[PDB]
């Protein structure tokens, strides 16, 4: 049954855009989904999006640009110390400043490049590149 409406979202995006689609409808829509999309757009990976309500959890219209290689979800959601990012970067991304590693810090959701500035940690949730 439905256990993770975030993994479904990122895998559906990566299946769609790999074949050529220009729009997707993320069916169940948390505020955590939208909070990922907010920072997955700022770096230049998707177009623009809005929330279409239908009396049951709403949906998400997101239109692609054909500019991502692979997205997914770090599932066990390990915690990371503030000085120990590179160790996890050498497992997911393919170069020294490639992609982003979305972290759920104590002050919102933000890419690790903005966590190492303020020096904080938090559970990992997903990764895009």
């Amino acid at each position: 049954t439905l256990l993770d409406p975030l993994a479904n979202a990122l895998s559906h995006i990566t299946n769609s855009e790999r074949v050529g689609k220009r729009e997707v409808y993320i069916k169940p829509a948390s505020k955590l989904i939208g909070e990922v999309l907010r920072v997955m757009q700022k770096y230049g990976y998707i177009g623009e999006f809005e929330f279409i309500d239908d009396g049951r959890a709403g949906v998400y219209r997101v239109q692609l640009l054909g500019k991502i290689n692979k997205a997914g979800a770090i599932k066990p959601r390990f915690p990371v110390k503030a000085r120990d990012y590179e160790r996890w970067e050498k497992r997911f991304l393919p170069a020294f400043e490639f992609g982003i590693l979305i972290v759920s810090t104590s002050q919102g959701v933000m890419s690790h490049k903005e966590a190492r500035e303020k020096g904080i940690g938090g559970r990992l949730i997903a990764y895009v590149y």
């Binding site: 230049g44 500019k67 991502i68 393919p94 170069a95 020294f96 490639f98």
Partner: protein, 229 residues
């Protein structure tokens, strides 16, 4: 660089082409190797490369990976024929790899070296490791993977000075292309050099299938083809 530059001036006369790219080349229109590739042509005349990459035949830009004789039975014994695998490339930015078949060893080598010029590709180089952060074209720009047969390879960037740490018949291919430092992680059966060679070739090809921003370029140093020879 002269003897391998009068060679083209000698070849460019006694060659009356039959395809169309031949006409384009022999009429001075197309004049540089970097402009027959990303446009959807077909290449069937092996003299086109002798004129734009005249060094591909220098005997130190050539290589004979394996030779093996195979057999088929018949009611009058066994009929035995060879198979050679050969690669060619200037040690800058271009490689090719082909096979060829025959019933003796010079003829198989000849056809192999031929079909290794009609299977040529250009790659992307850079420096994407975590240790070295210079901007020089000695290594792969970012990890890539290519598969073949039953053999998966994965090529990881490595810091300047560390050599080539890969199998035996990977070193020849990665030395003919210009790469000088790399790491590696493989699977499957890596004793059949045909499949191992084709997986390394496919990984080097897949190098140019990853999307990059106009700013990631001046952070790894990605050069395409030659880079100030």
């Amino acid at each position: 660089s002269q003897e391998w530059k009068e060679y083209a001036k000698r070849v460019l006369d006694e060659w009356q082409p039959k395809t169309k790219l031949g006409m384009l080349v022999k009429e001075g229109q197309i004049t540089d190797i970097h402009e027959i590739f990303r446009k959807g042509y077909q290449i069937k005349e092996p003299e086109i490369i002798d004129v734009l990459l005249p060094e591909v035949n220098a005997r130190e830009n050539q290589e004979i990976l394996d030779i093996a004789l195979t057999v088929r039975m018949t009611d009058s014994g066994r009929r035995v024929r060879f198979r050679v695998l050969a690669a060619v490339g200037n040690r800058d930015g271009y490689v090719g790899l082909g096979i060829g078949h025959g019933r003796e060893v010079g003829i198989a080598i000849r056809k192999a070296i031929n079909y290794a010029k009609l299977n040529i590709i250009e790659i992307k180089r850079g420096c994407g490791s975590w240790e070295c952060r210079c901007r020089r074209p000695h290594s792969v720009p970012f990890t890539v993977e290519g598969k073949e047969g039953s053999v998966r390879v994965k090529l990881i960037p490595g810091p300047r000075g560390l050599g080539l740490v890969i199998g035996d018949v990977g070193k020849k291919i990665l030395r003919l292309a210009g790469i000088q430092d790399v790491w590696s992680q493989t699977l499957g059966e890596t004793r059949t050099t045909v499949n191992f060679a084709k997986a390394v070739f496919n990984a080097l090809y897949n190098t140019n299938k990853v999307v990059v921003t106009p700013e990631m370029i001046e952070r790894y140093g990605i050069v395409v083809g030659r880079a100030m020879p």
